[PDB]
Subunit: 251 residues, 4 copies
């Protein structure tokens, strides 16, 4: 029978691309979302129309809180519900905005959001994924290739992305006895943020040595697909950059 | 007059060695502690017996919560109250224990203590240290040379230490325009846990290529006070391992 | 027409599996070898007997010396002569033996270890870039580069050099559309030569399945990096180590 | 009795600054040099005026060749003949010029020079240092903080420096039983070529978060002094960036 995948924040952009490619590949999918209800379901529609009863949505806030453990357990239960199993988890949902260390939301809701989405939620979803368990179980976390050359005033965001690296590695180690492989994919400049002015998008595009453009979500998705495939059966603890060389450029 | 430093989790072991070294090099010191009140006031007595009015204790749970921001603000304030300045902050305090992904603290609490002590409280304390500001201002984060080869089942801890790497870097970037340098010191195996039985202590020592033993607490302190000193005026963002070669030893 | 690939040290073990997989994917191949000439011409038969005229062999010593640049120029040149093109270069060949800080001369140890693992790869890359689709290079790195074997420093030195090439050439060749990346095995394809004790010694260390990578698992990552699914990947090095580099002493 | 150090390319600039400081710390010094005989000797003199019979010079080419092992072995013997002991070795001489991949030394020569100076000579020097020694014995390699963010068209230089990281770690591990520590110091932007236009110099300075200026050679030397000191006695395999945050700045 077909294998099943959760993708968090899958309604749009890189998560959507990841869900769709998983689906094209043969996976059933749980499309998680938080605010983007309509677009989660029009994606479920498009997927179901290709193959019936192979895409469900599932809603949750992944901010850090007393209920996040329960919420994450439910994101996983929702895959066991819909489809009777969970083979793959993709931690993609991510909050991303500035948090200057100096003044010239409150700071703890910033902690909860940035940290929760980017680290703690992936950790709990990792627990829950593992608890339930010729399989090919793997997890893939959306990392950041610029993690060691971070943007100005984004410390919390970066602490979250650093912790996810930490999680990737710890969980790879601890869960390899179970055959649960844990890897990551590190976009650099990919789909630019929607509000960003077009002249700012071009600035960033120009930085990238491979063809002076951002990666398509599709291109990110391909690195994910590879890591979930049987061609990655010996890979765990690896974080593939997909950055066009961006991480290599000195200031 | 004499500079002032805050050392978190300073009552004993490595934090006490830092406090002491900074005091001998001529700093006044805030000795932050959590539960170890006796050892803390005992340390501050010794240090004030050496040099009257140069040491204070300040108490605070560094567990993550919505008041942790004010608790950190107050640690910094305590230093400005007692001494009129704050030149150096050492982020030493840390919670350490297994958090197995697969199986009595709640996980939420496990998250709050492990992330909050090793990453969030430092972020917050950095913000406040920055906010409150001839001078040689620096921060020194106690990190972990094994961060990329972590203990089995210490994933929340390892995510906190990783995030602490991220802060060190992002903060160093963000606060260099203020002349605030931000660096780290990364033990490997130093003073073993108080209640580890000698036999297990030795398994760990035998792994150290340089001497087959652990770093004394002073050996850690030395790296700290180097990084604080004017012999490091241009160092920012560096984390210095003090692991006697252990991170280089493969399995 | 079908793309072409150079694989160094492709007569046997990982290098061979890589030449084979690239052939299955529809590439023509230049099979480089040094001493393993019998194996090398046998491989070429297999592949040519499967698709005619799609494999040649090419002998070279990749030890550092003043004729290396010429040797490396000629390996690339061999691919152009045999196939009219060269889309992919795989730096695989590598010398591997202890060189303690306390057989052969230290100058011969330097020239074999640094040559094979670093200098030939740099030379071959140069020649590859200068003779010019989905063009790219894959360097076989080493997942244990930052946690090495005791006494293997010339070797390690080579591998570190390789990382730097991989990055330096990734960045430099990008405006020419050449991608450069790496695959980094942990403990892989253990010989029958090694003792059961010593083979089990390494196998016990690997978190994922208590075993070494197969030649073909290392090759899989290679072909992923040359494929149209890696078009935005350059500068990247993929560990394929079953968790080994995450294991503390 | 006074300890003794070898410093390669000690005539000028950073290595001289290292020699001076080792000297001012109490070291007798071997000042090695290749073409700068006149400044080598003027330094030997300046130092010997300070303390008689504490500084010699030793000329050699450190390009890779059949005679490099012997030339390196001599350099070490030179310190032994002069001072009766070899305590510290600082590998600092480096060739540095662009070697583009794509269309007037021959490439064989460039290899020999860039890899010999940066990598093979430090290895051969490390062998002989070690061979003689079988206390506070340490080696310090001058590394590069931009080694993973390389300058465009400096592949052979970058390979050199990369191999050097590899030696540091390899040697640290292997020489640890002999009590010999092996560390590195990783300048980012220090002394700019004398002849480089100030307008070109400023483009590098302005990159540097910490004070928008290059490291002085004494700042680099402060890190080396630390590494050789008794404060660094458990420190091996470590590389300390001295870069004012430039390694942290993205494109
Ligand atoms: N874009 C890039 O160039 C880039 C660069 C480096 C790394 N990455 C990483 O690659 C991944 C994908 O990036 P992206 O730009 O596609 O992400 P994105 O557009 O910022 O957001 C991804 C999704 O995360 C979900 N999300 C945000 N906050 C949440 C919360 N509190 N609870 C639950 N879900 C939440 C959102 O879902 P709803 O819309 O359903 O509310 C959103 O659609 C991320 O992990 C990102 O950090 C991306
Ligand atoms: N020891 C090692 O071998 C080693 C290895 C790697 C890294 N490091 C790092 O070096 C630093 C010192 O190590 P160590 O072994 O001396 O640390 P430790 O004794 O395990 O912890 C130091 C102190 O941190 C404080 N702390 C713990 N939980 C807290 C909470 N919720 N709120 C406030 N404070 C809390 C405690 O103070 P009270 O006693 O007053 O409660 C504790 O005494 C740590 O960051 C550690 O991770 C040490
Ligand atoms: N095997 C592992 O576990 C492992 C681990 C980490 C990294 N890697 C890397 O992955 C790659 C493949 O590994 P491997 O174990 O398959 O390699 P291997 O069998 O040790 O060597 C492969 C080939 O390199 C060639 N070679 C050696 N010295 C040479 C010289 N002076 N000139 C030209 N060619 C020479 C030999 O060709 P001939 O037989 O024709 O003489 C040999 O067949 C290597 O770069 C290796 O370092 C492997
Ligand atoms: N300055 C920087 O910004 C920077 C940045 C990153 C790393 N570093 C590293 O820090 C170290 C010192 O840098 P620096 O700028 O002061 O050095 P440098 O001036 O570029 O060169 C140092 C010395 O190396 C010697 N040298 C060159 N080729 C040689 C050969 N074939 N054999 C023997 N010696 C040779 C020269 O000695 P003679 O003059 O006697 O011929 C020269 O004075 C170097 O290893 C460098 O790579 C420096
Ligand atoms: N969830 C999420 N969304 C994003 N949109 C980004 C973006 C993003 C922001 C601006 C332009 C392109 C991508 C990044 C990001 C991280 C480090 C650096 Br250096 C640069 C960008 N992380 C991100 N994470
Ligand atoms: N606050 C704190 N206390 C500690 N006692 C440790 C210890 C510690 C405990 C037992 C034996 C050696 C060290 C560590 C630690 C970090 C990485 C690895 Br791999 C292993 C342990 N972090 C620690 N952090
Ligand atoms: N060209 C080449 N051949 C090899 N056979 C190896 C081997 C190898 C060694 C022992 C058993 C099997 C393969 C490795 C290798 C590198 C780092 C560590 Br830590 C351990 C092994 N590199 C290698 N490179
Ligand atoms: N032996 C040597 N000398 C130098 N003068 C440099 C310089 C240097 C040359 C000009 C301006 C600034 C520094 C560098 C260097 C390292 C990383 C980058 Br990204 C760029 C240059 N390495 C060097 N190595």
């Amino acid at each position: 029978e077909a294998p099943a995948a959760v993708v968090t924040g899958a309604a749009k952009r890189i998560g959507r691309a990841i869900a769709v490619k998983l689906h094209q590949t043969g996976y059933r999918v749980v499309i998680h979302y938080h605010n983007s209800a309509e677009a989660a379901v029009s994606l479920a529609d498009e997927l179901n129309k290709e193959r019936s009863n192979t895409a469900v949505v599932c809603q949750a806030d992944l901010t850090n809180s007393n209920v996040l453990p329960a919420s994450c357990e439910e994101i996983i239960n929702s895959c066991f519900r819909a489809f009777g199993r969970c083979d793959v988890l993709v931690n993609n949902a991510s909050a991303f905005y500035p948090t200057p260390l100096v003044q010239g939301k409150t700071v703890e809701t910033q902690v909860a959001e940035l940290i929760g989405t980017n680290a703690i939620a992936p950790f709990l979803l990792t627990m829950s994924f593992a608890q339930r368990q010729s399989s090919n179980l793997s997890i893939v976390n959306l990392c950041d290739a610029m993690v060691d050359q971070p943007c100005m005033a984004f410390s919390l965001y970066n602490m979250g992305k650093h912790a996810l690296v930490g999680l990737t590695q710890s969980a790879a180690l601890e869960l390899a006895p179970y055959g649960i492989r844990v890897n990551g994919v590190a976009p650099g400049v990919s789909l630019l943020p929607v509000a960003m002015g077009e002249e700012e998008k071009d600035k960033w595009r120009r930085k990238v040595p491979l063809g002076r453009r951002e990666a398509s979500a599709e291109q990110i998705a391909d690195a994910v697909i590879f890591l979930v495939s049987g061609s990655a059966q010996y890979i765990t603890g690896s974080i593939i950059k997909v950055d066009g060389g961006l991480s290599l450029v000195h200031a």
